[PDB]
Each structure stands twice: as structure tokens, then as C-alpha cells.
């Protein structure tokens, strides 16, 4: 056995951070590499806390089904984990524009002044704080059943604009709105989403009453600035429930 001394690169995880010079360059890029991992624990802390209201007393609920046939549950996160690759594949202005859009919407539902600071500094938390609020207070499109044939037109009228930002300035398709990546996945997304739809209209009689007032409150708090804008939200809740947050493509 020859006496192999430890490498000089292996020794460079044993030094002290000094300020003046190249030492600050490596000190910066390992701090924010770990500040990113703080947000991923910040975002996950509120993600399963809001999810903890969905399962109310330990028994699971019909809202949080992930599949209904044999292969239905397993194919879901193949779409999800590849969509996460498509989210961070965006450009600069698609990303910084979505940073400042959530900072305009998270700022107008924060109850605390600490909670305001938690959304400004950590952008992956301000994102999932919006998304978790719509899951528990069911103000998504995927939970809104329109109560009339005009509302099904009125909800269809607004998401034609919401789908219109899933395409670029010239009309070619963005990477955001996309329903498949492999042979047969896009058809499997269709047979998935109807079981969400049959169970969205399968709530109790006491929970349709709750999100009726909530989606009306959801539209007139974050998107409405005038009196007519809070008239379509008071009168047709599902039309206000389909108002997305403009950082998506769909």
C-alpha cells in the first residue's frame, strides 16, 4: 500500500469563508444553493398543511383520489414529474414575470406582516401559498360546477382568455399548456380528468354551499377592481372561479 494523501479538492470543504476576493464568490453560490432548499421546505410545509385540511379526521376523502382504475394512479406522477421539468424550462421573462405576479396576489391575502415577508423573500413559497388556498377553499376550475347553461357559457368565455396565454405573441404554442409527452399519455390524461369531474359534482349538500360563497369571494378579492367586475362574481360564482392567476399558461 502506497500512502495516498487526501486530495486538495477534498480539503477545500474544510476552509473558512473569507470576504475579500474569490472566497466570496464560492461563499455566495453555496449559500443560495442552500437557500433554495430552504424554500423547498418552506413550500412543502404549507403544501401538506393545506392538504391536511382535505383529509379532515384521518379518513381519506373523495377529493384526493389519484386514480380509479388499475393503472390510473401510477401514470399520474409521470405526467406531474415531467411537468415540473417543463416548468423550470421556461425563459427569463416567463419566470421573473411569474415572480412578480404572485407577489401581487400573495400580498393581498396575507393576514400578518410576517407572512408578507415570507412571500416576498421566498418565491417558491408565495407560489404554493396561492395554490394551496384554492385547494382547501375550492375555488379552482376543477371544483366548480356551473349551476346553469349561461354559467357554462360564462365560465367558457373567461378560460378562452386563460387558454390564450398558453400561446405566444404570434399564436404558436407555448410549453405551458401541454397534455402529453409519451405514446398514449395524452389519451390517459383525458380518462383521468373525468373522474375528477364526476367527483367534483359528488360533494355533500353542505359543501356546495361553502364554495359557492368562496368562489364569489375568490373572484372579487384578487381580480376585481370595479363594481361590474364584482357583479359577475356575486351573480355567477363559477365564472369567477375560472379566473386563473396569470403565472400559469392554462
Amino acid at each position: 500500500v502506497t500512502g495516498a494523501v487526501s486530495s486538495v479538492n477534498m480539503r477545500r470543504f474544510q476552509r473558512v469563508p473569507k470576504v475579500s476576493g474569490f472566497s466570496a464568490k464560492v461563499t455566495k453560490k453555496n449559500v443560495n444553493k442552500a437557500l433554495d432548499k430552504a424554500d423547498m421546505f418552506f413550500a412543502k410545509s404549507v403544501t401538506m398543511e393545506g392538504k391536511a385540511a382535505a383529509i379532515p379526521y384521518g379518513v381519506y376523502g373523495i377529493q384526493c383520489m389519484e386514480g380509479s382504475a388499475k393503472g390510473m394512479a401510477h401514470e399520474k406522477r409521470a405526467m406531474a414529474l415531467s411537468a415540473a421539468f417543463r416548468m423550470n424550462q421556461r425563459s427569463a421573462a416567463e419566470k421573473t414575470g411569474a415572480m412578480y405576479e404572485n407577489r401581487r396576489l400573495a400580498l393581498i391575502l396575507a393576514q400578518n406582516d410576517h407572512q408578507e415577508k415570507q412571500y416576498i423573500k421566498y418565491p417558491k413559497l408565495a407560489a404554493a401559498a396561492l395554490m394551496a388556498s384554492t385547494e382547501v377553499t375550492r375555488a379552482c376550475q376543477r371544483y366548480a360546477v356551473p349551476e346553469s347553461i349561461e354559467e357554462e357559457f360564462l365560465a367558457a368565455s373567461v378560460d378562452k382568455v386563460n387558454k390564450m396565454r398558453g400561446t405566444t405573441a404570434s399564436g404558436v404554442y407555448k410549453s405551458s399548456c401541454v397534455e402529453g409527452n409519451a405514446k398514449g399519455q395524452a389519451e390517459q390524461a383525458r380518462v383521468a380528468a373525468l373522474a375528477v369531474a364526476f367527483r367534483s359534482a359528488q360533494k355533500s349538500a353542505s359543501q356546495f354551499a361553502a364554495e359557492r360563497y368562496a368562489q364569489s369571494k375568490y373572484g372579487r378579492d384578487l381580480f376585481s377592481s370595479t363594481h361590474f367586475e364584482e357583479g359577475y362574481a356575486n351573480t355567477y360564482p363559477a365564472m369567477a372561479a375560472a379566473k386563473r392567476a396569470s403565472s400559469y399558461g392554462y
Binding site: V59, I62, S68, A69, K70, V191, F198, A201, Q202
Partner: protein
């Protein structure tokens, strides 16, 4: 959802009655043959995927109009969904066989099936025939009376639980028709 134990208390909380040993003799008579319940839940999942293949071919052989353009079970998409929902109602009635009583079948499967099976145009006479296949097949497994298969169970009296699951497909046929 409720089980065979959340049935006795809801019929006492409506009268504010203490659950004493007057009606606890039937809960002592529930666990008495309580082995044979899950010794019957094994008798569905053991060959579950071939069950609806016996059903939908029995639906096609009895009513052969579904293969025509205009029959519901026509296309590869529309045969799939009938193959998809022939399983799903079998899954939920296995829960009602398991849980002791059918308060989960009437709350997560029948909650709006009768209206989406008239607003879509699904033939309710073949639908009650699809159920009528899978009611007579359960009593060929829970009584070990399959023609192409025997199953090793401890032999005894179990047919009171055979009429139990026969009381349950007569709750899903009594839902959509």
C-alpha cells in the same frame, strides 16, 4: 362513510341511548362469524380481473347490438369505459361486503349515477344485466361453486353471508333503473 359498528351508534345517537348489552349481542354475533367475512373478501380479489371479462362477454353474447355502430359499447374508447366501469361497481360492492353494510356504496358510487346514466344514453336494461351477472358469480365464489375452479376453504355454513352480498347487487340495480 360507515361500517357495521357505525350503524349501531347512529341508531342510538338519534335516541341518545347508551349502547348496552341488549343489542351488543348482535355485535357479539357479528365477530362470531367475523372470520368468514374476510374469508369471503379473499374470494373476489383472487380472480377479480377475469370477472368483468365474463360479464361484458355475457353482455355481448346476450345483447349483440352493442357491436353495431350505434350500440354504446362500440368503439375502442367506448368499450374501454364500459370495461372501466364494470370493474368500478365491483370494487365498491366488495367494500360493502367488507365493511358490514352498504353505507359507502350508496354515498360514493350511486351519488349521481342514475342521472349520468340517463344524460349519456347508457342502456339501463343491459346495465341491470351486467350487475345480474356479477351477483350470480359472487355466489359461485362465496359458495365455492365455480365450474372451472375449486378453492380451499374450511367448509361450514356460510350461505347467510351469501344472501348478504345478494342483498347488495339488489341495491345497485335498485339505483340506476
Amino acid at each position: 362513510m360507515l361500517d357495521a359498528f357505525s350503524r349501531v351508534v347512529v341508531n342510538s345517537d338519534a335516541k341518545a341511548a347508551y349502547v348496552g348489552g341488549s343489542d351488543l349481542q348482535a355485535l357479539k354475533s357479528f365477530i362470531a362469524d367475523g372470520n368468514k367475512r374476510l374469508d369471503a373478501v379473499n374470494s373476489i380479489v383472487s380472480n377479480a380481473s377475469c370477472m368483468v371479462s365474463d360479464a361484458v362477454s355475457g353482455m355481448i353474447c346476450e345483447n349483440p347490438g352493442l357491436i353495431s355502430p350505434g350500440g354504446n359499447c362500440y368503439t375502442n374508447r367506448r368499450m374501454a369505459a364500459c370495461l372501466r366501469d364494470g370493474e368500478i361497481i365491483l370494487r365498491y360492492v366488495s367494500y360493502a361486503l367488507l365493511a358490514g353494510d352498504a353505507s359507502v356504496l350508496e354515498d360514493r358510487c350511486l351519488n349521481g349515477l342514475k342521472e349520468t346514466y340517463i344524460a349519456l344514453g347508457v342502456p339501463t336494461n343491459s346495465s341491470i344485466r351486467a350487475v345480474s351477472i356479477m351477483k350470480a358469480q359472487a355466489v359461485a365464489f362465496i359458495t365455492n361453486t365455480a365450474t372451472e375452479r375449486k378453492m380451499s376453504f374450511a367448509a361450514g355454513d356460510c350461505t347467510s353471508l351469501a344472501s348478504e352480498v345478494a342483498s347488495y347487487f339488489d341495491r345497485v340495480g335498485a339505483a340506476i333503473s
